[PDB]
Design an enzyme around this catalytic site. Structure first.
Site, short mmCIF file in Angstrom:
data_model
loop_
_atom_site.label_atom_id
_atom_site.label_comp_id
_atom_site.label_asym_id
_atom_site.label_seq_id
_atom_site.Cartn_x
_atom_site.Cartn_y
_atom_site.Cartn_z
N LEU A 20 0.82 -1.21 0.00
CA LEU A 20 0.00 0.00 0.00
C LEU A 20 0.86 1.27 0.00
CD1 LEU A 20 -2.94 -0.99 2.42
CD2 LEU A 20 -3.04 -0.70 -0.06
N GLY A 22 4.52 3.28 2.28
CA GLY A 22 5.40 3.29 3.43
C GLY A 22 4.94 4.31 4.45
N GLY A 23 5.36 4.13 5.67
CA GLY A 23 5.09 5.09 6.73
C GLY A 23 6.37 5.83 7.06
N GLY A 26 8.84 1.26 8.22
CA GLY A 26 8.02 0.11 7.91
C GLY A 26 7.38 0.19 6.54
N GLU A 27 6.81 -0.93 6.12
CA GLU A 27 6.13 -1.01 4.85
C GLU A 27 4.71 -1.51 5.14
OE1 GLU A 27 7.22 -0.19 1.66
OE2 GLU A 27 8.78 0.87 2.80
N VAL A 28 3.70 -0.85 4.58
CA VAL A 28 2.30 -1.21 4.84
C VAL A 28 1.72 -2.01 3.71
CG1 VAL A 28 0.01 -0.35 5.50
CG2 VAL A 28 2.08 0.89 6.24
N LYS A 43 1.50 -3.43 8.85
CA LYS A 43 2.72 -2.65 8.71
C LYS A 43 3.87 -3.52 9.21
CE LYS A 43 4.65 1.51 10.84
NZ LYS A 43 3.97 2.57 11.62
N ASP A 134 3.07 14.62 13.86
CA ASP A 134 3.22 14.44 12.41
C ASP A 134 1.90 14.62 11.68
OD1 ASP A 134 4.87 14.11 10.15
OD2 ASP A 134 4.73 11.91 10.15
C1 LIG Z 1 1.24 9.01 0.71
N1 LIG Z 1 0.27 7.90 0.95
C2 LIG Z 1 0.09 7.64 2.41
C3 LIG Z 1 -0.91 6.51 2.65
C4 LIG Z 1 -0.56 5.24 1.89
C5 LIG Z 1 -0.33 5.55 0.42
C6 LIG Z 1 0.69 6.66 0.23
C7 LIG Z 1 -1.69 4.23 2.07
N2 LIG Z 1 -1.71 3.63 3.41
C8 LIG Z 1 -2.89 3.08 3.92
N3 LIG Z 1 -3.84 2.76 3.02
C9 LIG Z 1 -4.93 2.15 3.50
N4 LIG Z 1 -5.20 1.78 4.75
C10 LIG Z 1 -4.23 2.10 5.61
N5 LIG Z 1 -4.24 1.86 6.96
C11 LIG Z 1 -3.14 2.42 7.52
CL1 LIG Z 1 -2.95 2.41 9.21
C12 LIG Z 1 -2.38 3.02 6.57
C13 LIG Z 1 -1.25 3.94 6.82
C14 LIG Z 1 -1.23 5.21 6.23
C15 LIG Z 1 -0.20 6.10 6.52
C16 LIG Z 1 0.80 5.74 7.40
C17 LIG Z 1 0.79 4.48 7.99
C18 LIG Z 1 1.80 4.12 8.95
N6 LIG Z 1 2.58 3.81 9.73
C19 LIG Z 1 -0.23 3.58 7.70
C20 LIG Z 1 -3.06 2.78 5.30
C21 LIG Z 1 -0.43 3.01 3.74
C22 LIG Z 1 0.66 4.06 3.67
O1 LIG Z 1 0.69 4.71 2.38
#
Ligand SMILES: CN1CCC2(CC1)CN(c1ncnc3[nH]c(Cl)c(-c4cccc(C#N)c4)c13)CCO2
Length: 290
Positions: A20, A22-23, A26-28, A43, A134
């Site tokens: 999905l 990165g945070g 970690g990698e989501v 994550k 953040d």
């Molecule tokens: C720029 N964008 C940012 C957001 C994203 C696409 C690219 C998408 N994202 C998500 N998408 C759906 N459900 C989710 N549930 C969860 Cl929790 C996430 C999520 C979103 C953002 C940070 C973290 C962390 N640590 C986790 C998440 C993962 C990170 O990258």
């Protein structure tokens, strides 16, 4: 340390789907529960012997203890073969940054609604003695039900671990000047930093980038620290109401001693006006789909 940690492969419970994003670290990944079919976000953080265990301990402590309608749901964590997997809510539309890159600028009512929901999550976090640190469009997620959820406590965890580690090498404070005692105990700032970031985020949702996004990051840092620094404003004054201009003016109060708290901001006209409901976000999701 955490008694509820699952000491097993998350693949026993989930089928791993696409990456999905990165945070902060970690990698989501998107994943699906094998028995119920419920979608989740996992994550994954590498956890070899010399990795940052204190930060991950702090992040999971925040996720476990800070449950609110405006914070992404936490389902638990898995530790297996030197990998930690943090299970959280899958928010189908991703972040507001992912949304406005397709959709363009949010309307003032949509921004007001996002601000109200984020302020409710911030007032809750600050009440539990936590600071997000953040807040930005990338960390505010939107689910298919049009709900607004704060995500990524990575920065909050890193600062929290660093401050706990430092408070061991602090030593006696009896000869410390008050301004030194302030950095030793609190890092030199407080939860009101989240109110400023929300003000910046409202401008980001209105203009598609935060103020000075095209200026060198080091130059922006230098400019903020200098005396005479003027807080940012919306560029197109005629596009926004007096309420929205005042919301930016007060959340972007330079002095933290005078910046309003999350509960005070919740009484502001912008987030108290008529017509604020999830329907505004459902319209944004309609535009995202078509
Ligand atoms: C720029 N964008 C940012 C957001 C994203 C696409 C690219 C998408 N994202 C998500 N998408 C759906 N459900 C989710 N549930 C969860 Cl929790 C996430 C999520 C979103 C953002 C940070 C973290 C962390 N640590 C986790 C998440 C993962 C990170 O990258």
């Amino acid at each position: 340390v955490d008694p509820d940690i699952f000491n097993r492969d998350p693949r026993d419970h989930y089928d791993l789907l696409q990456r999905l994003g990165g945070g902060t670290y970690g990698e989501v990944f998107k994943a699906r529960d094998k028995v119920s079919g419920d979608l989740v976000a996992l994550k994954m953080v590498k956890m070899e012997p010399d990795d940052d265990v204190s930060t991950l301990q702090k992040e999971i402590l925040i996720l476990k203890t800070c449950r609110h309608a405006n914070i992404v749901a936490y389902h638990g964590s898995y530790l297996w073969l030197q990998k930690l997997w943090i299970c959280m809510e899958f928010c189908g539309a991703g972040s507001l940054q992912d949304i406005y890159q397709v959709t363009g600028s949010l309307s003032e009512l949509q921004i007001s609604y996002v601000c109200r929901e984020v302020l409710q999550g911030l007032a809750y976090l600050h009440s539990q003695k936590k600071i997000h640190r953040d807040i930005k469009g990338a960390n505010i997620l939107i689910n298919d039900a049009g709900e607004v959820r704060l995500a990524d406590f990575g920065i909050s965890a890193q600062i929290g671990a660093e401050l706990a580690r430092r408070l061991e090498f602090i030593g006696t404070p009896y000869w410390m000047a008050p301004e030194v005692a302030a950095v030793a105990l609190k890092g030199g700032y407080n939860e009101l930093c989240d109110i400023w970031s929300l003000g910046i985020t409202a401008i980001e949702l209105a203009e598609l980038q935060p103020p000075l996004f095209d200026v060198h990051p080091l130059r922006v840092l230098f400019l903020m620290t200098k005396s005479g620094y003027q807080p940012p404003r919306l560029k197109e004054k005629g596009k926004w109401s007096a309420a929205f201009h005042n919301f930016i003016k007060v959340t972007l109060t330079k002095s933290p001693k005078k910046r309003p708290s999350a509960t005070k901001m919740l009484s502001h006209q912008l987030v108290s006006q008529p017509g604020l409901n999830r329907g505004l976000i459902l319209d944004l999701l309609d535009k995202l789909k078509n």
